Every structure is written in C-alpha cells, then in structure tokens.
Amino acid sequence: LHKEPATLIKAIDGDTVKLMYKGQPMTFRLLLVDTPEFNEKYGPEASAFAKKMVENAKKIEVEFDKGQRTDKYGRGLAYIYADGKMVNEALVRQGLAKVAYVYKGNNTHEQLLRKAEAQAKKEKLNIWS
Ligand SMILES: Cc1cn([C@H]2C[C@H](OP(=O)(O)O)[C@@H](COP(=O)(O)O)O2)c(=O)[nH]c1=O
Ligand SMILES: [Ca+2]
C-alpha cells in the first residue's frame, strides 16, 4: 500500500471526513471501522477525537487498500493518516470505534486494528467501559 497526499476540507464525524484528493473534494469513509453516529452514545466523543486529529495535523495522507476505492455512496474508502498516525487505528485504540465492515480484499490492516481493539477492550475504554 502507498500513502498519498490530501488536505483537510472539513471534519464530518467519527469515521467520515471531507478531504481534497488529487485536487477534488471527496468524502472519505474510514476502512475497517465503525464509530457510533453523532446522536448515539460515544458518537460525540468519536467525532471530537477524529476532528482534533485531522485539524491538528500538518500532513494528511490517504492510503487506499487493494480493492474498491469508492463505496456505493461515492465515498472514498481509505486509511487516513495524520502526521504519520493512522486515524482508523487511533479511534479503535481509544475504544471510540469497533473493527467492522471487514470485506475481503480491502482488509490489509485488519489484524493491526484488531490488536488495537483488544487492548482498548482490556482497558475497558469508552465503548468497552
Ligand atoms: C466501511 C464501508 C462501508 N460500506 C457501506 C456498508 C454500509 O451499507 P449500508 O448503508 O446499506 O448499511 C454502509 C455503512 O457506512 P456507515 O457506517 O457510514 O453508515 O457503508 C461499504 O460498502 N464498504 C466499506 O468499506
Ligand atoms: Ca458509523
């Protein structure tokens, strides 16, 4: 997999974000995770956490997996990095997202994220509390 440039346009919620990628605005949906919706328990915390992470970053990168790059809604599907740190993994590690939506052929970072989930669960963080 390869990291590619992008710039923040705006935070949306825990697991979606509006980025400019190859010069075009796009909503990205984070691979392999599911945050609560904003109106749900821990939804506001997931949104705040993802937002801070992307808004503070000097460098946003997009990393496509091996399979489809757009979902049926036209959302880009990628791993999103903020100054080298993966937003997908960080949400899971803090118990602000569950590993989810693991489809064959877009699952490169599955086990990295499950490891983070297991440690979040041990610490009974947030969703696991
Ligand atoms: C994360 C991801 C979601 N999706 C689709 C599955 C779900 O379809 P449905 O809308 O029919 O439930 C939806 C979940 O996204 P959200 O969690 O943002 O709602 O997006 C994919 O197709 N591929 C993916 O990799
Ligand atoms: Ca969601």
**10-23 in b/e burial notation, b at 16+ Cβ within 10 A?**
ebbbbbbbebebee
Pocket of ligand 1 contains residue 54 by CB under 6 Å: no
Please give the structure tokens belonging to residue 30. 């984070």
| Cβ–Cβ < 8 Å for 30, 79 | yes
The residues near 1 (Cβ < 8 Å, ≥ 6 apart) are 63, 64, 65, 66, 79, 108
- Tell me the C-alpha to C-alpha distance, in Å, between residue 49 and each of 1, 18, 53, 55: 25, 15, 6, 10
**What is the residue range of 106's domain?**
1-129
Between the CA of 48 and the centroid of ligand 1 the distance, in Å, is 21
Counted domains in the chain: 1
- Tell me the C-alpha to C-alpha distance, in Å, between residue 77 and each of 31, 50, 88: 6, 16, 11
Method used to obtain the model: X-ray
| Cβ–Cβ < 8 Å for 28, 75 | yes
* CATH number reported for the structural domain that contains residue 107 in this entry: 2.40.50.90
Q: Is 69 a catalytic residue?
A: no
Q: Quick one: which of 46, 54, 73, 71 has its CA closest to 8?
A: 54
Q: Quick one: which of 99, 95, 94, 96 has its CA closest to 79?
A: 99
Q: How far apart are the first and last CA of the chain?
A: 34
Answer positive or negative: Cα dihedral of 31, 114, 11, 4.
negative
Between the CA of 24 and the centroid of ligand 1 the distance, in Å, is 22
- Tell me the C-alpha to C-alpha distance, in Å, between residue 60 and each of 3, 42, 98, 118, 127: 9, 24, 23, 27, 26
Pocket of ligand 1 contains residue 40 by CB under 6 Å: no
Spacing of C-alpha 100 from chain mean position? 11
Q: What stretches of 1-129 adopt beta strand conformation (E)?
A: 3-11, 16-21, 24-30, 33-34, 60-63, 76-82, 85-86, 98-99
The protein residues having their C-beta less than 5 angstroms from ligand 2 (an ion) are 15, 34-35
Spacing of C-alpha 110 from chain mean position? 13
Distance CA 88, CA 110 (A): 11
